[model samples]
Target: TCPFYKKIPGTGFTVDAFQYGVVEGCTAYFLTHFHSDHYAGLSKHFTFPVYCSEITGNLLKNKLHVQEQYIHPLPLDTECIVNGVKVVLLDANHCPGAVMILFYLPNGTVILHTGDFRADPSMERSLLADQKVHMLYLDTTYCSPEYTFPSQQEVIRFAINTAFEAVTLNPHALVVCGTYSIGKEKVFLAIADVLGSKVGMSQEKYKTLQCLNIPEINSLITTDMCSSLVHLLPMMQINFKGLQSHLKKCGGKYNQILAFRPTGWTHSNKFTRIADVIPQTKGNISIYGIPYSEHSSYLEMKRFVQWLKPQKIIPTVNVGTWKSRSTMEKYFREWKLEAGY
Candidate 1:
């Protein structure tokens, strides 16, 4: 019986299929989120029965082309029994299809495995599950209170203001900003609401944005929102690099152009650069950040981890990735009081 777990200073390795533990032969593996680090080894080596959310399955089937039979799509809180280990998928709120894997043993032991989560209240409330938790494997990305994160809306507001400023300055340009294709639909709706007019979106983006309840923006254009906003669009069509050209050729037509950026679009360093660049684009780009997330945050993560109170905390997504591990460790350290007390 492979019961012992090999622990590294940084990456937490336990008796899971992702990491080779004491168990020589592993049967099942649970996929957390689509982030590169979380599901890194799936299609490469281990391809047994993998548990994940439907959104994640869709991503895997569409993106990775993993075998369909090996994939098990689980709903939030619903328990799926594979071999004797009960696995539950919880909404991670970190990325579109991210999930926290909770494992239950026949001995009534409950372990909550937090895949890369943030500290947010919503995530905590959502995971206010029915069962009692034994241990908490948490996401302590920013455990230290010293790492102050700007509110989601605050960043969006800054982006929005800069976008409007850019539009106002050009008054004849099709401004564009890089954004994720899916999760940023609400953001674009907010921008369209501010503009009081519809923004041209592609078929793919239009349908994706359909959930926002903004009918006015939905009817404007029937194309792919991503392509129209940037990338493949020609200078006459729509793109960030072509914004100046669009303005010069079209005269003072559309004036300002807006784009939707889902979260996780920029790396930590490039995002830092954007922090500097936002100021420069103030009068020429119409940027906006909407309060949206696919993963849980530090506070929310704390709340859930406390609720789960698992025997041990194992943080994945950092093994092959660069995430703040020390800070996350400290975040859970305080939970000793909140949890035990």
Candidate 2:
């Protein structure tokens, strides 16, 4: 059974299941972004054409080295015809190039695929005003109220300020900030501008920033760790064992290491919001988990669903025994019940 891929009742179109290699069978394919989970099975080796945002297309060519001919860059907010179906892309606000796909089928049914995005106020309002959406494919990353977080701007401010404060407290320590390979460039850029220094990143990340051609980032990124007090490293590399090994390679120049992880999981604890700085030490390395997320929070998701009121809700994940009708009703029953019938 095809889990992530779903077909329109009367139309032959499919959405966001390239990871399963169903490209050959679908009328056309759409990519929401370049995240590994969304873009896993794609490569230059395949010859099928894929539609996505301009930034995503560039990333596919530069980062994944996907062939240029098979990539079609979709312009934001503009409707285009693909296989007789009208489609448009909107800013997802989750990452640099993420987008939400809006499909207008020939039978007058409209579907929206929110590709792992944080909702935008004006965009959400405009879409709701249309009142034509029949189905919604949601990103259910933080579907429970227990998971909440502060705005991205607030979280970034906290992260940058915390980095400065950490370096100030431990003069000989290097401040390492953790981030995904593609998302969270804003955090890196802010720290560099405020600290009046360049930020060092892995050669791969540096090249990505270069391909983006973002003037704010190109001037602030470097491959040399010794060039700056703050370093931008992959989220996985900020762990205890990883940090300890990194120090050894650099000949233990820094006496202590301070690491910060920008994630929404920090809010899962008691007495926390937007940002919570929990200090810890593991063999000379200090770690802090900052609540910065790329997905919508529970409140945001609930509000969105209430306003849009899609006839059906589909979770963009693997579905086995549980079918769409059962899954949607089971998951959204509470949401609807809270609305007071």
Let me know the TM-score candidate 1 reaches against the reference structure. 0.64
Q: Compared with the true structure, what per-residue lDDT tens digits does model 2 show for residues 300-331? A: 88887776778778876434346644654565
Top TM-score hit: 2
Q: On residues 1-341, what C-alpha lDDT tens digit does candidate 1 reach at each position? A: 32232221122223234544323444555666665655655563335676677777776665667878877788777767766566767776565666767666677777767666555556555544576677666555544433334466756666566556655666444534344334444445455444443555444444444432334644544454332322212224333455555445444555555543444323342235335533224345444322345444445556666665656676653433445555555656788676794
Work out the TM-score per prediction: 0.64, 0.89
Question: How far is each candidate from the true structure, as Cα RMSD in Å?
Answer: 7.0, 2.8
Give stretches of model 1 more than 4 Å off. Answer: 1-24, 42-47, 123-127, 157-171, 180-185, 196-278, 281-300, 303-311, 317-331, 338-340
The lDDT for every candidate, in the order shown, is 0.52, 0.75
Model number with the top lDDT? 2
Candidate 1 residue 278 C-alpha distance from true site, Å: 5.2
